[PDB]
Design a protein around this motif. Sequence first.
Motif, PDB file in Angstrom:
ATOM      1  N   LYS A  45      40.354  32.123   5.243  1.00 50.50           N
ATOM      2  CA  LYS A  45      39.961  31.258   6.359  1.00 50.50           C
ATOM      3  C   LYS A  45      40.641  29.877   6.292  1.00 50.50           C
ATOM      4  N   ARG A  48      44.932  29.639   7.235  1.00 50.60           N
ATOM      5  CA  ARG A  48      45.219  30.109   8.598  1.00 50.60           C
ATOM      6  C   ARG A  48      46.705  29.960   9.048  1.00 50.60           C
ATOM      7  N   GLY A  49      47.351  28.849   8.693  1.00 45.94           N
ATOM      8  CA  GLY A  49      48.747  28.580   9.041  1.00 45.94           C
ATOM      9  C   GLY A  49      49.607  28.196   7.854  1.00 45.94           C
ATOM     10  N   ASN A  50      49.250  28.703   6.668  1.00 49.13           N
ATOM     11  CA  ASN A  50      49.938  28.439   5.415  1.00 49.13           C
ATOM     12  C   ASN A  50      50.940  29.549   5.156  1.00 49.13           C
ATOM     13  N   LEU A  51      52.235  29.185   5.091  1.00 52.22           N
ATOM     14  CA  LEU A  51      53.362  30.095   4.856  1.00 52.22           C
ATOM     15  C   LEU A  51      53.264  30.788   3.474  1.00 52.22           C
ATOM     16  N   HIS A  54      50.654  33.616   3.595  1.00 52.59           N
ATOM     17  CA  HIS A  54      51.102  34.767   4.370  1.00 52.59           C
ATOM     18  C   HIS A  54      52.208  35.523   3.649  1.00 52.59           C
ATOM     19  N   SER A  55      52.899  34.858   2.718  1.00 57.59           N
ATOM     20  CA  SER A  55      53.923  35.496   1.907  1.00 57.59           C
ATOM     21  C   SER A  55      53.255  36.206   0.744  1.00 57.59           C
ATOM     22  N   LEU A  58      51.740  39.743   1.851  1.00 57.67           N
ATOM     23  CA  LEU A  58      52.777  40.773   1.956  1.00 57.67           C
ATOM     24  C   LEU A  58      53.378  41.090   0.594  1.00 57.67           C
TER      25      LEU A  58
END
Lengths: 70, 104
Positions: A45, A48-51, A54-55, A58
């Motif tokens: 939560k 939300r917009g943290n690179l 999100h890396s 994956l």
Amino acid sequence: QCRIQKCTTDFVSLTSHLNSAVDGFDSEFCKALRAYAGCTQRTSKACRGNLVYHSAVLGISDLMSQRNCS
Amino acid sequence: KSSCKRHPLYVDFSDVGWNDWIVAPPGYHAFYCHGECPFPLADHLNSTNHAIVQTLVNSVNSKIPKACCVPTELSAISMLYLDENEKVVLKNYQDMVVEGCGCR
């Protein structure tokens, strides 16, 4: 505030076991992977917009494929 | 072989699996560095003294590898993402695009 670096540092700390394989590191690394996966899902939560986050998601599921865990 | 140069790289966020959180752009021209770092060094005006020492050490002992071709000048990009309220948010992401390559 996004606490993704906390999850990575903990994982890098736990994955300090070479190699063996007994075998082995499969039951060790997939435990470390799940702990990391769980930590990232807990801070989800806030990131939300943290690179870097999100890396990490994956990156974790890529390691989960080879070798097979869960 | 080919010396330290910048090479094209278009990062399509859909192929990478990021289309779910990045609203816009659909991707970007990130580029990448690649190539041999022999004497004289690429981006020699900004290159470190250590790279100069290591490429000299490599010239005497091949067991020590040459310096490496990495991004030495980077630039940021603005992206759009959705927050919990399902509202679009603009954020500038640092060191996303390669402007120049050098030996480090």
